């Protein structure tokens, strides 16, 4: 308010200027006596350019939603307007292609693991969800484009699903049976390349395509990236806290259809609940065959085999790490032994002056003394460390023999079992 | 004040400081204006130079710095450059300027924008023609080439601006305005039309490309009195936000009516009264609704041109059940101003 | 400088530039002040106008622009408006102002804040009453209505400010300050009390609601000499940050001691010495600790009113083992100043 | 303009406003300069004071505010302080200054940077010695203590700057420049050397520590004519960005050639032509490439000292297949200027 005061409309001007001239306004006189001050002095000026130059010249030197990689479960804190997700166009990394190809030829492979203890540190209310996205064509046998608009549930070859295993909830890629997920169209929004999918039973999933920035993988203390990508049996209750859907874009957008799963972060009570129900369902499924031994054993021996396999893998890991530790400590030793040979050559060098107290060399002699005794202590330390590493390495070498005998026994058990 | 008026060039540094506060019931979320300290200082410079007897060139710039902000990350919040332009005044044909300046439609909407603090809500900034924007080329005629006294007209072209937000973006536009002042009476009519950018269409609300505004203004100012009445209609031009949906956009149709009546006294006093109303129509999912509907009752003591104090009490008639999360609460503001 | 003095109105544009640098061992993380280039320029305007013989109105504003920043995204970092307020001075009863200004307790703390660059650390900014804050209304009496010469008092109300960070927030507050100057000697006492907002209480450190500051100052200034000693105590008012915990908050109790002794010479020279200390008590989990503990030794050559150079060496006595990650390193600063 | 010249002290407020626009094919991503409205206003203050007959002290500061930005969160984008320094001029021995100022190499590169809007592309800002930077201490001699007229030399030390970006960061540096002006003819030579910070070395592009720049300039200005030719070579000094890779760093080697020919008329006219070229060598993965290669054809009409208009058409010869995603499009700019 108050803007109207004054504020003339039409053209804008206030009053008469002091002088006429655009660039030549002063008082008077020209023809100069050179005096600098008299009535015949022209300039009538002083302190012309006492200050220094300040950058002479014009001086106009020049002129006046990071996307989450496909297949990498990440936390999205919700808003009132729903979840925020931004996909990319760049095709899914080697990792996920690998996993899904392996899996093509209920079991599954664990992408990530969840830890409420940590997830709450940043999201105390436990409102955050876990979003994951894949390019529809890698999941669906029939491209989503070439699909009736009437279909609400498209068939899928794999899905991203929450499971409860080893006392943690974890997000993982499942497959191997008839599966099928909601198909929903993506209304656009103000932002350019940004739509709103609404999956039944999830929040508003507002997506945003972005193929300008190079894709990123977000890293959150709760969500881990389980290196072990072995195929394991999957939950009977898999998905009990997951909502996924194939989302298609409008024809005049040019955006490929994308699959997205959105899983809840379970609290630890809910995780004990899921584990319990899972154990009850495993109990159920166990028998009902001809007898308990026929099937229960089938299962205990296949699980035991898969575990022995994990044991072998971790043992091999330990042995490849112990081989490097061994070689490293060995070369540290070698190095320190060359340094020792050096210092002891310098002592042979200046030995002459050992009993010559008034020579230059007889300084460098004690100095080489110091050098040698140090390098020797060093060598001793490298020897201790190398011995220790050789011990660890031998232990590992036996660990492998034992673990792979165990794998052989568990694989024979798992054969006998699978025959019965 | 004029600090340098030499060499056929004159510079008028004009700046002011305003210790301001807003009061209202509650925290102030629903208050018309807000609540708390709104102190701010503005600085600007105007300059003229008569290149020729019949041709002179002028340049004006203004910036606003807010003092209510803290010294942390929010120091720059609310700090901006309002006006920055230049131009030349020929003897009679008129004058032509370019830069960042008020839109022609603001010329019409100036009559109502006489309130001490509130007022001119419809004249949003960075909007098509109602408020001050950057990238305008304007030609103006005074007294129709000196033919008819008091009747002046202006035309304005608006270069497209592609910004991040539809609220601040625009496209190619055109507009015109005419104002006849006779014997104290004043009449004005302004019209502006432009095309909405693709980003603008992307808004959930709003439909169509031609964003159109136009307005008509009447007034009488003299004898320490000032009456004014501006009626303006627009299509797909006015911004609107929905707190319930937390979604924004533009109004398919809008009618706005503003009325002001202010008296001034010899002893530096100016009581003021203002009625206001704005109704948007054909809103997507909200039908027709009223954006603003309130009375003003306020006053201003003018100690002198350079010192003044003022108060304004806004009786917000908006209801709480309004379908756009608009603030349905009254408000008041008290301000003191120094200006050179 | 006075640029406009006409029509019973006077405008004084005051601005300066400071080429500054900070040195210290290492990168400067542990240095008291810091390290590197700290060049900055400040601009401001003061204005007065005698409305009546007994009544005059004044408005003052100041801004600080930093030159150390680059021309990229960090250009605006550290740029802010220090002071922006207005007010009126009656003949004898006193004067009343409002805006963004120093808190009454700063009046007491002015005696110690005479150092060239460092000093007045206790008078933090955006703190309740010790430093310059926004939303204060102050009334001042000079010579107790002209009754007793040299004895003047001020009172200040502080409107609540709900900001994003507890560091910059406050609540309803009140305060007062009195200063008696006699024969060169000077005495002052200031007290301020306010309520902490929920964000402040929610902070891990600090406990209680009444955020309280108060200070007492004594001095003797004459014959080119200036001695000063300010002792101030506060509750839940001083800000504190823990690098080890990377957590901030307020101090349940704090005592601060400041001592200054500066001499001036006819030949534009002014050596200075300053002692300082601040001890916080009842810290949550840290008991009692020292926030700052250092000596000053510096000097200043005054070429004239408009040109000066200066140097300051800060002997930080704080130890590295302090339980708040405080800088246990010495520091030095060298500055040159032009000012109009 | 000189606003205050009293008490042996003089203040010159200098500021201007520029209504500017850039045209080019397409949205302007690939345009040399850009496209749209580029209006901006600069404000600055210079101040001097003769402390003694043989010793005077000066301080200067400049800021640039852009008007193209909107009034939302992006208001401050492109707003910065160009120059902010101070210093003293002794009678004959010379002068010493410190602050944020042009690097010595700018002295050599000034000859080519005479264009109305474009020009001086090689003289990047916040670069080692070619452009204006903060933390420099410069000494200058005029006419070699008055021994040889027209021959003046300068030396400059550059304090290290560890910023967030390698583009804006630097380290300890030194430089010198010599300029002999005789009877209108002019010759200059400048050299600068500094060390790159870890962030700069850590950049994917660029390799080595010694960032080196140097330049040689020749000119003749008289009879309303201005000819100039500057050749400068640098190592690990020029910044470079790859749109294809969206990765930046510095250029292992760079050669830059600038040529200018401008004529001036009595009736406030000055047509201009400029050739320019810059080729980087030993680029990581791109071998040798041309960063900029264009012609200039432009003009400027000077209505008076305070008012001017100008146009510049840049014939960008860079090809689309350039291996750095550089803009291979022409461009043009049209500007109007008021300045006091």
Residue numbers in the entry:
A (entry chain D): 3 to 66, 85 to 125, 132 to 446
B (entry chain A), C (entry chain B), D (entry chain C): 1 to 340
Please share text taken word for word from the publication where this structure appeared.
The present work focuses on the group A endonuclease (DNase) colicin, ColE9, a member of the E group of colicins (ColE2‐E9), all of which use the same import machinery but target different nucleic acids in the cytoplasm (DNA, rRNA or tRNAs). At its N‐terminus is an 83 amino acid intrinsically unstructured translocation domain (IUTD) that houses three protein‐protein interaction epitopes (Housden et al, 2010); a 16‐residue TolB‐binding epitope (TBE) associates with the periplasmic protein TolB which is flanked by two OmpF‐binding sites (OBS1 and OBS2). Escherichia coli porins OmpF and OmpC are abundant trimeric β‐barrel outer membrane proteins with narrow channels running through them that taper to an eyelet, 7–8 Å at the narrowest point. Tol‐dependent colicins assemble a translocon at the cell surface that involves its periplasmic target along with the OM receptor and translocator which together establish the import pathway of the toxin.
Single particle analysis revealed the presence of two populations of ColE9 translocon complexes, one where the translocon was intact and a second class where BtuB was absent, which we refer to as the partial translocon. The final post‐processed map of the full translocon is at an overall resolution of 4.7 Å, according to the gold‐standard FSC method, with local resolutions ranging from 4.7 to 16 Å. Although the resolution of the full translocon map did not allow for local refinement of docked structures, rigid‐body refinement were carried out to generate a molecular model. In the fully assembled translocon model, the 22‐stranded β‐barrel of BtuB sits at a 35° angle relative to the trimeric β‐barrel structure of OmpF. Unmodelled density, most likely that of a single molecule of LPS, is wedged between the two proteins which likely contributes to displacement of BtuB relative to OmpF. The cryo‐EM structure of the intact ColE9 translocon reveals that the colicin also has to overcome a 35° tilt of BtuB relative to OmpF, which it does by having an R‐domain with long enough reach. The coiled‐coil nature of the R‐domain, with BtuB at its apex, means the cytotoxic DNase domain although absent from the current structure would sit ˜60 Å above OmpF. In the full translocon, the orientation of the ColE9 T‐domain is fixed by the R‐domain’s contact with BtuB. Finally, TolB is held on the periplasmic side of OmpF through its association with the ColE9 TBE but is not well‐resolved in the full translocon model. Density for ColE9 was better resolved in the full compared to the partial translocon where only the T‐domain was resolved.
